[PDB]
Amino acid sequence: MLDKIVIANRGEIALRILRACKELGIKTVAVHSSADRDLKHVLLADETVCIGPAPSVKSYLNIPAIISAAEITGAVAIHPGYGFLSENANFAEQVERSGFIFIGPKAETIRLMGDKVSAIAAMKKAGVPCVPGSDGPLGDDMDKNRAIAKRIGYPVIIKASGGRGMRVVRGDAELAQSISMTRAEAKAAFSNDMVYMEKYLENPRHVEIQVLADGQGNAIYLAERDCSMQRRHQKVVEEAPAPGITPELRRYIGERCAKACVDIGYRGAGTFEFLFENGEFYFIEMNTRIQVEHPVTEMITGVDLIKEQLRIAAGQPLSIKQEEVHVRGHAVECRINAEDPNTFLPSPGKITRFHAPGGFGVRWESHIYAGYTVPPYYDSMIGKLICYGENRDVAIARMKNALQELIIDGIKTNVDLQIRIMNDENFQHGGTNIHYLEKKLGL
Amino acid sequence: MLDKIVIANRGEIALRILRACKELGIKTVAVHSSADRDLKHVLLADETVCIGPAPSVKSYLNIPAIISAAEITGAVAIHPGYGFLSENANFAEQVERSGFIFIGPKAETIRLMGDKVSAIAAMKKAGVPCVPGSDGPLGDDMDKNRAIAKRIGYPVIIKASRVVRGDAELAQSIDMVYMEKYLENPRHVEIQVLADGQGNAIYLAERDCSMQRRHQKVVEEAPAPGITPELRRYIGERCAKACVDIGYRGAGTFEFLFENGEFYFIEMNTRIQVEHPVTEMITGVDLIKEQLRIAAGQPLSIKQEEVHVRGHAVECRINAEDPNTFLPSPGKITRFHAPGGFGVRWESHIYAGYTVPPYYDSMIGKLICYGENRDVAIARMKNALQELIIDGIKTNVDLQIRIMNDENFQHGGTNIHYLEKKLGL
Amino acid sequence: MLDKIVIANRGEIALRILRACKELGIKTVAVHSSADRDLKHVLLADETVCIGPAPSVKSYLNIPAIISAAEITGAVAIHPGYGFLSENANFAEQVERSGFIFIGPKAETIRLMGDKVSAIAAMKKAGVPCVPGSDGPLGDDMDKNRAIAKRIGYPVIIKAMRVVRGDAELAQSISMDMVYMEKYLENPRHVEIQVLADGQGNAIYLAERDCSMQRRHQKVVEEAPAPGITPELRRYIGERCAKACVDIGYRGAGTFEFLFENGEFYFIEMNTRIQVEHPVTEMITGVDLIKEQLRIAAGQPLSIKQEEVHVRGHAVECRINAEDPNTFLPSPGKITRFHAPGGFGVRWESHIYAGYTVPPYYDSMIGKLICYGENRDVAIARMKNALQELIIDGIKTNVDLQIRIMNDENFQHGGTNIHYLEKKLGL
Amino acid sequence: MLDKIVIANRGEIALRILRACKELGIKTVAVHSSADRDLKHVLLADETVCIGPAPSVKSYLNIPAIISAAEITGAVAIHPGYGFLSENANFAEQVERSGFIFIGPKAETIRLMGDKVSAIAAMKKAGVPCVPGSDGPLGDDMDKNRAIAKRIGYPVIIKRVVRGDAELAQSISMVYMEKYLENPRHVEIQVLADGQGNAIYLAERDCSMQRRHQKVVEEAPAPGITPELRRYIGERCAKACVDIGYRGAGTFEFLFENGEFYFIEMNTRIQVEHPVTEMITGVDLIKEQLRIAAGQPLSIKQEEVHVRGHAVECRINAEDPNTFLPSPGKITRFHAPGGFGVRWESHIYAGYTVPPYYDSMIGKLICYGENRDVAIARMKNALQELIIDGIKTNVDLQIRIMNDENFQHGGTNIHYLEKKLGL
Amino acid sequence: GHIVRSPMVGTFYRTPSPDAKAFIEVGQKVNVGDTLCIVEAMKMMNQIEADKSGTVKAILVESGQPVEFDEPLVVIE
Amino acid sequence: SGHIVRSPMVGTFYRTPSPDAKAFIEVGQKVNVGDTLCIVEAMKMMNQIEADKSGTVKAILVESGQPVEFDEPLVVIE
Amino acid sequence: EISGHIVRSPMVGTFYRTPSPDAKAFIEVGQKVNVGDTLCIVEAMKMMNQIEADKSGTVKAILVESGQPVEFDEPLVVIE
Amino acid sequence: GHIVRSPMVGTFYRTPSPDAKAFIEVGQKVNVGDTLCIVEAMKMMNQIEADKSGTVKAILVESGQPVEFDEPLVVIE
Incomplete structure (x- = not known):
């Protein structure tokens, strides 16, 4: 067990990690900006430490402040979450070098997969389809x-x-x-x-594979997720498993990802993002960290990915074997953002009334509450609604009702947009590509 | 499917049924007392009908009013829920003859199991240990x-x-x-069952509901600690054939006292129960949707081999009452926040600004936590209870926290007298 | 004085009476319907008694319940407020017969002014212009x-007609x-005169109020004093009203409503009770009319004699109703967020609060905003700001309508007639 | 009038000034720290400008930021309020130097009364008893x-x-x-001067109830003060205003013992407890500040200033009522008292967080009455109605004070409150 | 201003029988005990009577339309 | 709670018709519809509150001589 | 609240893209910048404050137009 | 009065060295730029200076005790 950790993040993911820590009996240290004194997880944490003013660059990206907090509280480890410093090799380096455990992969591994060229090299060498x-x-x-x-x-x-000529x-x-014609054009344009x-790949789907590796030779894959519904390359809706993916194809891509983990000596939780077309996978990137949409994978496999991160960081080997990993049911996730649902303009402000949806298969992941102000800093995602069901159709229906129940007044949200998407017949069919949402909202 | 139903109940169970219906595309009609205009399920329902003043006897036990609501709204069926009129044979009778489907068993079956003597007769006849x-x-x-x-x-x-x-x-x-x-120190162990009234009947594991005050359940869990798969198969199979024998229809529960590896029938709840959600967590079966499917005339979609017990689930009942004197605690909820997270399921109609009226049972919500094993379920429950905020009225939340911290409860297998022995009653 | 009284009313007026009682050290008994368990004044009262189900007829009009409540609590007096039973002669009678003081006028006086014919008779007899x-x-x-x-x-x-x-x-x-x-009287103004009589021969008038702004004969805005009314004219009609009080042996607070056109007053009715818009009078005279009601009921003679009644400044009142501001359909429901206006000269009279549900019974008036000022213009400006500050979410209100009225140039001029508001909204 | 002003302050006084501005048709500019985005007056203002981070030294004491805000918004004047920079001679100087109106007295007047030696001297010369x-x-x-x-x-x-x-x-040796002066009372005189030779006094206020020299309760008029004694000290204060060429609103604080006054200080600015004076005279002191800054002469004559009734004010502070430890946090539920003669001055509301910076005073309850006894009873009731949950407040302490028999008789000295609480 | 509300759930009717005259009309005076309307519930023709004497100001419900408990039917004065 | 017979009026509660008379009911005693459970004095009328549903008396929630309001729980059955 | 590294204003003043009315803008969208490089000016009380980049990369967006007022912590520029 | 707050997270110390004298004491006069204390973060001993001149009213933190950003350290009168 980790005696005490610093949660180097904020909002919903910070609350998620905090819950994991309480369940495992791990003492929590919530580091926060001066504008996040009212965060739910901060109010629930065992110890709190203000690390800087509102701007991310001076708080949650402030490496010296976070490590310093770790020392004064006497934490043993630091959880980076997603975004901010989670994939910052330098940060991980100073964390370990300062005598703290970095809940994530080795710095060398982050750099490896942090660079397009070296990442591709490793995947091909490992047999991951590129x-x-x-x-x-x-x-x-x-x-x-x-x-x-x-x-x-x-x-x-x-x-x-050179650098066109495409x-x-x-x-x-x-x-x-x-x-010929492209070589001429390349010479008249790029001077080469x-x-x-x-x-x-004209019509790909964003399909990603979840993995866990203890950094002791063991590595498992936890099915896949489809995150094709996107705006400006940002995920809006995610689901698991991916429609149309047979268990044999899932086993195909999954086993290769696992062996890749073993090869690069991966540690912690990670994700292999792929473009998916005509039953073929094409590596895009590996997120060497937990992802926003991890909950849908938890729903269909029953695995608590955060608790697994914590167990692995404590030096424990994978308790779960690939054979014991089974896909059951289906899960969808709508990201709730504080933004105008038509212009996607951020919408910070005070939440005047809030009510969370409930019921069978309904999972609400958010730090917001009535009276809580969403500050004019940070990403606009304020919550995540995840609905599980025996099958895809039941999951979607649950999501419809739940969004209809969700109340968030005082600020604009994209809730109505999510309702439209759930009502979208092509989405109900499943298998929409990575261009569909913008293809739908008018180019 | 069922085009439209009346939810002949209130509070959390009424909201539960409403969600089930919205998911199936079934139109809802919320009948309510004059004191329940602010109920969430009432606010969400497609149609509403006030059926009487605050007192239950003049509203939710008002048979003529409820049937009348069904008639004027043009509903096809009526879901009674638990308590109130759910086990009222007379009510079921008038519902059917008035041309509505009663989402539950036949009136004949309710009467049969509604009498201690006749119920026993049936159970022995079926081979159920009494x-x-x-x-x-x-x-x-x-x-x-x-x-x-x-x-x-x-x-x-x-x-x-x-x-x-x-x-x-x-x-x-x-x-x-x-x-x-x-039976001096027995445990309350009950078996969930579903029967389509067409010869098919399955059992969905068991539940332990030993934590009680005045014979009122405070905590429930599934499966029951100490119960082997063979013991579960024994009692479960007997309950299922009993369903076949009495021609049971809908969802039901066979309550047993359990001592020295033996079961003793006490009563059969011919209706959905409060603590049904813990069974749903570990089996994945939506019991309410199954009630609606069976009432619509569909045969059981789940066949016994497909029923699997996975993980563990605990449920703490949240009541509006003084946690030390158990005095009902009506009043306005000034601030409310629901717990969340993996494996956490909140079942309640309450919200900030909502007043708990000085009528009806004091249960205002139910917190249910699931986990890969019993220990994880309990830890989840501790955290969730600590996150749960309900101000303006006293609740038993603190009591539930105490129970989760109780070492004998953490061991499991506490008897039906333990809670009152602990509170000095 | 009075040890303990029953507040035979609800909502804002019940809260007003409760405050008056609290200041005088008078114990309070809030009688309430089953739907008014959450009323602020009920929550503040020293003793509470449920007297019946939601409908007024079985609660606030339930004479036997109210009296019995007084009996078990040992109250000495009962305040009826406005509406409900305040002008119910039989009620006053039964209150007295049970040995309780009825905070109001004599039953005979209620019937007298409660009947069109008998009221007119008295007014002519007293010299009040009809x-x-x-x-x-x-x-x-x-x-x-x-x-x-x-x-x-x-x-x-x-x-x-x-x-x-x-x-x-x-x-x-x-022919027709x-x-x-x-x-x-084509273009008259509703001008009414406030009066107090101890029922011992004394009677004073406390200036007048203009209540011309109306919808379907229901008051929306009131102000005091009434623009264009000279002190000599004020003295004329006021003295007439006081003499009428002495003649009919009036007791408690009352109001003489008149239509006013080209310097003439025409009696329409006498409200034998406190009125909704009494606060604007309190602002400009400094007199606490509720406390005066209580002192008179306790048997005390008027402490104020006419010479001591002075008009200072100006006061306006916008009635806040729970209704659609364009179709005026009642708008019950839960108030999801509430914030009251404040500041110099601002007076908020309401029982509502965040989380409180406005029940689907009773009149739709949920509050009253009253602003005072050194002059009429300052009063109006304060009313603008305060209305803009006022927040009531969860239910529709007529707040926006009140804003338009304050911005209305003809209202800002003053002296608008009883048909103007409906003329402006096209009804 | 003033076309547009910057309200260089926060909280209740900022909201008060904003209301004054709205009534006069003056456009408002709310400058605020990054932690005060949710202030009611900020939400009501016509224009907003963040001037720095939470700490006062980098926001409300940030002279360049405030003047710069006035410049970019095109304001003509700046209202400093009380505290912060209101008595900062340097600040007033730079405001006038940048071509803006300082809603307050002349900088030289601030320095004069800002230094004990020179202030006392002026008082000597003007006939103010020292x-x-x-x-x-x-x-x-x-x-x-x-x-x-x-x-x-x-x-x-x-x-x-x-x-x-x-x-x-x-x-x-x-x-x-x-x-x-061992057992004196804090008695202060309110004044207005147009800086054009005119100056009036608006009765006095008693502010004896204090903790650590900080006022807890104020009232007007001061018990025991006759109209002739009031005219004695008041006229001398007015003359002092004329002598030093005072402009705007000001207050002459005195220690008062055995019917005698002893000058302590002149607050060259509006004070927290000004509302009690407004209640008994009907004069809107903030509106008068704004009119005087606009270059208007006093509209009111000393003869037209009349004392009617009585007013008391309890300061509402976010603090533990027994240890007076600051108490920042979110207000989970709020309800303001109402009714005849009740005046609530506060920016707080349900859901608003009191930040862990700035003074602990979050509101002011002021009750008026035909007489002192009625004012006090009114204060009791209003306090009992006041609901502020989520944070510690001194409401209970104020209740105790209203119930205090020595306070009800009146005339308690500046040491009584601490004498009562055993500190 | 007196509101006669429904004491039961059912269908509202103006007449004792489909083709008979309505019990009351606006402007008509009524006494306590007089039948103002009918609320049909489960084939029972329930007669709703006046609980206060006065003149009918308004009739808030049309025939054949459903009504709930405590629903306003008639306005009287 | 169980089935609640509530008060239909405001008045004073009494367990017996007279101080030295028998109580109408006691805990554990069975009752049928129409049986007198208690008394509520209102006005000059001494109103007897009777059971509206048959069963056994669970509890008596009010002591003699104490006042009661509308809809106040007086007795519980079964 | 917009994503991307945000250079915010450290002071109240008027925003300008260019050093002088007739001159070229310090930066353009798509341009590479280094730490210390001037992105814009915030004129406050005769001070011509040059706001510099605190991170190297490419200019994604410029959130304010010339002649427009800016407040403390106001987003000015986005980088890579 | 004026609160000098911590500009960083670390451990508070009154002296530049373990066996040296404290930079300041209560009642002492200080000018802008003067070192009042130290906040150690990752072995670096950062000197916190006065941002306003005056006399020390109080020193709100004990040596060896941790401090966070914007935490009140010293008050000047």
Whole structure:
């Protein structure tokens, strides 16, 4: 057991971690900005420490302040949460070097997966499916280039090395000339006639795989999540499992992700985000941290990912074996944001009346309450509604009623938007792509 | 499906039924007393109908008013909930003949299990283990009385309509009178069942409801500690065939006292129970939706092999009462905040500004926590209770916290007298 | 004085009486319906007694319940407030017969002024100016009828309501069974006079109030004093009213309502009780009318003699009602958020608070905002600010309507007639 | 009038000034710290400007920030209120230098009355009664010193306390002597001066109820003060205003013992307890401040100033009523008292958090009555109605004080409250 | 201003029988005990009587329309 | 609680018709519809409150000589 | 409350994109900046305060137009 | 009066060194820039200076005790 930890975060995730700590009997230290004195988790914590003024840069991104808090409270570990410093290799370094446990992966691992190039390298070497490409620029031999396009599978895309000069090709007959014309364009534009080729994923879905590794050779995968519904590349709705994914495909991608964890010597909780098209996965990134939408995975597997983070940080090996991990039911999550539901303009202010939805399969994750003011700093996400059901349709219906029950007055929220999305027939069908929400709201 | 139903109840259970209905796309009609205009489920219902003044006898026990509401709103069925008219054979009768579906068992079945004597008769007939008794009053013949005590096995108890631990103290201990076996420190263990009234019937594990004050449940949990899968299968299977025998329909519960590995039937609740949610947590079955499905004429979708017990669940009843004197505690809730988190399920109609009227049972909510095991469920419950805020009125929250901290409760298996022994009653 | 009294009313007026009692060291007994358990004054009272179910007829109009309540609590007096039983002669009688003091006028006086015919009789007898009329039905003689219209002065009104503005078509107007005639007051103002009488021969008047702003004959805004009313005119009508009090042997507080047009007053009714809008009078005179009611009921003679009654400043009152501001449908429900206005010269009279439900019974008035000022303009400006500060969420209110009225240029000029508010809203 | 002003303050006084501005049609600019975004007056103001972080030194004492706010909003004047920079001669100076109106007296007047030596001097010259003293040190002659103790009058104080000749000798061992007022009352006189030769006095206030020299309860008029005595001290105060060329609202605080007044200080600004004076005279002191700053001469004549009724004020503080420990936190439920003669002055509301900065005073309850007894009973009731949950308040203490028999008789000295609480 | 409310749940009717005249109309005077309307509940034709004498100011419900307990039916003065 | 017979009026509660008379009921005693459980003196009328549902008396919530209000719980049955 | 690293105003004043009325703006959207680089000016009481970047990256957005007033902690610029 | 608050999280100390004298004591006069105390964070001994001139009314924190951002340390009169 960890004797005492600092929760290096705020809002809902801070409350989530705090709850985990209480259940495991871990003493909590809530570090907070001067504007977050009223945070629920702060009011519930065993010890509190103001670490700076409102702005994130002077508080939750203030490494010296957070570590200093850890020393004066005598904490043994620090939980970074998501965002802020969770994927800051330098932060993890100073934390361990100052004699505290970093509840997360090794700094070296964060750097590895924190860089696009080295991350891709590791995944391929480990057997994790990445985006197929020419693996280097192209030559003048059109037989070779066509062999590469054939292997990869059309459609493909040609991109320039300089830096434009980009072009999608959907058939063999038009590849050669497409390279020529793109090489000319690359030379007249980027002053360099060098090009390369990748697989072109036109309609992908954001499908990500949850994993846990104790950093002692053990690693398991906890099914997947579909987070395709997005605005400006920001997730709005997440669900688990992903519609259309058979248990055999889930086992396919999952086992590869687990072995990858073993290879890079991963530790803690992590996520492998992939683009998903025609039954194929293509690595995008690995979030070396807990994610916002982790709760939907908890609902269908019964695994408490936060408690597992804490157990692993304490040096304990995985108690759960892959065979014992079963997918049951379905879960959806709508992010509740303090913003205008039509213009997405932040909406800080005092919450004049609040009531949380309840009932079978309903899980409310939020720090907000009546009288609590949402400050004009930080991300606009103020809560998360997660509904579970024996199947996808039941989960969605639960979500409809629950959003209808949810009351948040005093500030604008995106609740109405979430209601629209639940009512969206294409979403009810399932399998909408990563462009659909914006494709729906009018480009 | 059912097009529209009347929720013949109030408070938390009324809200529970309403949610079930909204999820199934069933139109809701909330009938309410004049004192219950501010109820959440009333505020959320599609249609509302005031049926009388505050007192239950003039509102929620008002059969003509409720049926009339069903008629004018054009509902097809009526859900009675628990308490009130849920086990009122007469009510079910008039509901049916007035052309509405009674979401529950047949009136004949309610009467059958509504009488102590006839209920016992049915259970023995079905093979359900009952409480050994004299089976008829007692005479002055002491040879007979001692023979009866011998069969039943000491200790025994004499009741009218004193405890005896030995032959020497029988004579004086014995106005119509009868004798039963005395179960000194038993546990309240009950079995959940569903029957479609078409020959199919399944059992959904058991629940322990030993923590009681004045025979009123304070804490419930599922499954019951110490109960092996073989013991569960024994009593469960007997309950299911009993359902088949009496032709039961809807959801029901077989309450038993449990002592030295043996079960003794006490009563069958021919209705949904308050503590049903703990069974839902560990089985994943939505008991209310199943009630509605069965009333709509559908056969059981769940077949016995598919019923699996996973994890553990605890439920603390939240009552508006003085935590030391148990005086009802009506009044306005000035500030309210519900607990949240993994495995936490809050079932309540209360909110900030809502007044708890000086009528009706004092239970205003139910907190239910699920966990991979019993210890996790209990820890979850501690945290959740500490998060729970209800100001303006006294509640038993502090008492529930004490119980979760109780070492004997943490061990599990406390008897039906333990809570009152702890509070010095 | 009075050891303990029952407040036979609810809402804001019940709270007002309770405060008055608390200051005088008088023990309070709040009788309430089952739906008014949450009333502030009930929560503040020394003793509470439920007297019946929600409906007023079984609660606040339940004479046997109220009296028995007084009996078990051992109260000495009962304050009826306004509305309900305040002007119910039988109630006052039964209160006295049970050995309790009725905080109000004599039962005989209530009936006297409670009946249109008997009230008019008394007023003429006392010299209070009433509406000129034909004094009897009219015949077929057009010479007679025209002479009568001449005396009264055009325009005139025909009743069994049809207006004649000139001689030439009076003849035809009679056509449209037996008919009387009155003066037609087209653009009058509701001006009323406050009075106090100890029932021992003394009677004073406390200036007047203008209550012209109305919807369907229901008061929306009141002010004191009334613009355009001179001190000599004030003295004339006021003295008339006081003399009327002495004549009919009035006791307690009362109000003489008049229509006022071109320097003339015309009696309509006497409210034999405290009125809703009494506070504007209190602001400008410094007199606590409720405490005066209690002192008179205790048998004390008027401490104030007419010479000592001085008018200072100006006061306005907007009635706050729980209703849709455009369709005026009652708007019961829970108040989700409440904040009362404050500041110099601001007086908030209401029992409502955050979390309190306005029940679907009783009148829709839930509060009264009263602002005082050195002059009329300062009073109005304060009313603007205070209304803007006033927050009442969860239910619709007429607050926005009150704001429009304060911004109304004709109201700012003052002297608007009893038809103006409905003329402006197009009704 | 003033087209637009900056309210350089917070809390109740800021809300009070804002109301004054709204009634006169003056546009308002609420400058606030980052921690006061939720202040009622801020939410009601026409324009808002954050001027710095929570700490006072970086916000409400931040001269460049406040003047800059006035400049960007285009305000013409700045109202300082009480506390903070209201008596900061430097602040007033820079305000006038930047081309803005300082709603208060001239900077030179602030300095004059801001220094004990020069202030006292001015009072001497103007005829305002000051504390009798040796008026300079004495040397050897003990006949002189003893004669001085007699004239100046026992008991006396050095620079300590001497009650007799026998106890003078040892106590003297530069030195000076003053009159020692052992059991005095805090009596202060309200004044308004247009800075154009006119000056009036608005009766007095008794503020004897104090803890650690901090006023807890104020009332007007002061018990025992005759209209002739009131006219005595008042006229002298007005003359003092004319002499020093005073402008705006001000207060002359005195110690009052055996029918005699002794100058302590002149608060060259509005005071917290001004509302009790407003209740008994009908004068809106804030509105008068604004009119005078607009360049208008006094509309009121001394003759038109009449004292009617009585008013009491209890300060509502966010603090433990027994240990007076600051008590920041969220107010979970609030309800204000109401009724005839009841005046509630506060920015707090349900859901509003009292931050862990600034003074602990969060409101003021002021009750008026035809007489003192009615005012006090009214105060009791209103306090009983006042609901403030979520934080500690001194409401219960105020209740005790209203129930105190010595307070009800009136005339308690400046040491009584601490004498009562055993500290 | 006196409000006669429904003492039961049912369907409101103005007449004793479908094609008979209404018990009352606006402007008509009524005495205590006089039948003002009917509330049908479960085939029972319940007669609602006046609890105060005066003149009918208003009739708040149309025939064939449902009514709840304590629902306003008639306004009297 | 159980089934509650409440007071229909304001008045004074009494357990017996006279000080030296028998109590109408005591805890554990069975009663049927129409049986007198207690008395509430209102006005000159000495009103007898009777049971509206049959069963056994659970509790008596008020002592003799004490006042009661409308809808006040007086007796519990079963 | 907008995401991205936010350079906020440290003072009350008037915001300006350029050093002088006729000059070019210090920065543009898409431009690379280093710590210490001037992004804009906040003129307060004759002080021409140059607000500098406290983090290196690319300018994502410029939240205020020239001639407009700004308050303490007001978001001015977003970086990478 | 004026409160000098902590600008950082750390441990409070009255002296520059364990066996040295305190920077200040109650009643002592101080000017702007003068060191009043130290707040150690991660072995760095940060010197907290006075931001206003005057005399020390109180020293609100004991040596060796932890302090947070904006915590009151010293009061000056």
